[PDB]
Amino acid sequence: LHRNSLIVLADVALFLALYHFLPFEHNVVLGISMLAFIAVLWLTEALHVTVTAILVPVMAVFFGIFETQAALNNFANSIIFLFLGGFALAAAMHHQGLDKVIADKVLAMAQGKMSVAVFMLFGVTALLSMWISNTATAAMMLPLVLGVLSKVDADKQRSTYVFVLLGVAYSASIGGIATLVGSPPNAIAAAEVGLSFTDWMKFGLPTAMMMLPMAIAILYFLLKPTKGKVVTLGIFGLTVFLWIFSSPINAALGGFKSFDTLVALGAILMLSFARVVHWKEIQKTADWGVLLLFGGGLCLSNVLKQTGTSVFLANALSDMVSHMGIFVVILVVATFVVFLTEFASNTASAALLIPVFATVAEAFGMSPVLLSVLIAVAASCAFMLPVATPPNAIVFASGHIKQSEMMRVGLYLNIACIGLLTAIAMLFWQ
């Protein structure tokens, strides 16, 4: 506060302002004033991300857009649960100390000292993050990353943090795509368009395994150089096997309608029956307010719809768009890759935009998928400043940080991103 406290107030004014004049049509007035109002709180963060989320539904309902239980049922949506057991799988894989060994194992696999070790770290960050979490994975990775440079002290110069520490934060964010879980933007794409685990994986996984080298290499030239729980490991693999091949498997049992969730809910089940994780540790590791957030953004979408806003937008958007894209259109949306670097919460960014862009592509009768993936894949591309995203913050503390060296470097990457994404987006468009 009082900043945040007033901003809300400013935003209430903004709403009342739009709501009361903005003549248009009443139910579009609603959608817009609401759209804008929520557009603010989630950008910045004037309230907490999760609060505004819980704000969304009560604002439908009152205003009569929905009825309480229907507005609420948004939270029960299946991807949320897919995500929930994503968390569970991590939580277990942590508390049994599986990740600890992975790094200890792959790092030490580097044999001697430094040279290769650094890159090892990068991969293990990306691989590990694929599954666990960005910040979490970055945080955990950081202390091992300091250990690798000790006799590597180097008042001169860049290796200690610039590169390796900065590399890590970046790897942490890159393999954050590549899997529907996590980070949460992927989840929110998936919720919106109804992607399967492997559906999303088809896109991210490769985009990730290119953007990674591209990033580290860009990074390189602008700097440089100098135990019984296998059950967990196995339960992990089966759950992931079940996810990839979900299609034939589900096909082959009949049904099943959102298999990937049952596969996931199926993990927490086998994990807790196998006695390899306690629910306390699930409940802690689980970010309950992202799951809450998912539903917020789902409710938003249905608001944009019932209200008529999502169609109105596309109407007004029409003449303009028919002239430009899709190649200019996706260059341009992919240019909100620059936009997760300013106040982000890539989550809250994704939370805001995907509903808007997917549900307009719907009144144009194209697939909400392309934009919805891209927007989400772009939001994870946040580099160039702490913060967000937090892995940046994580690395920014301690040894020879930069603050303008992030700034420089993150610019050449963020661009080779906006380029690389536009590139791929175009290919899958064939």
Q: CA–CA separation, 205 vs 202, rounded Å? A: 6
What are the distances in angstroms from CA 350 to CA 146, 192, 207?
32, 11, 18
CB of 77 to a second copy, least distance (A): 7
- Single out the residue of 242, 128, 248 nearest to residue 182, CA to CA: 128
**417 Cβ contact list (under 8 Å, min separation 6):** 211, 337, 378, 381
**Is 134 one of the binding residues for Na ion (CB under 5 A)?**
yes
Stretch that binds ligand BNG, among 61-69, 93-101, 145-153, 327-335 (CB under 6 A): 61-69
Under the binding rule (CB under 6 A), the answer on residue 91 touching ligand BNG is no
- Count of residues near ligand BNG by CB under 6 A: 9
Decide: is 59 part of the binding site for ligand BNG (CB under 6 A).
yes
27 binds, options a second copy, ligand BNG, Na ion, none, Cβ within 5 to 8 A by partner type:
ligand BNG
Q: How far apart are CA 415 and CA 156, in angstroms?
A: 28
Q: How many residues bind Na ion (CB under 5 A)?
A: 6
Residue 58 sits in the site that holds ligand BNG (CB under 6 A): yes
* CA atoms in the 13 A half-sphere facing the CB of 49: 22
When CB distances are held under 5 to 8 angstroms depending on the partner's kind, the choice from a second copy, Na ion, ligand BNG, none that residue 176 binds is Na ion
Nearer to Na ion, 128 or 358 (CB): 128
> Does residue 27 interact with ligand BNG by CB under 6 A?
yes
77 is in an annotated binding site: no
Query: What's the rounded Cα separation, in Å, for the pair 243 and 130?
Result: 14
Residue 421 to residue 378: CA distance in whole angstroms: 8
C-beta of 21 vs 288, nearer to a second copy: 288
- State whether residue 235 is helix, strand or coil: helix
**Dist CA 168 CA 321 (whole Å):** 39
Partner that binds at residue 63, options Na ion, ligand BNG, a second copy, none, CB closer than 5 to 8 Å by kind: ligand BNG
* Residue set of the binding site: 133-135, 183, 345-347
- Interface residues with Na ion (CB under 5 A)? 129, 133-134, 176, 182-183
- Interface residues with ligand BNG (CB under 6 A)? 26-27, 58-59, 62-65, 269
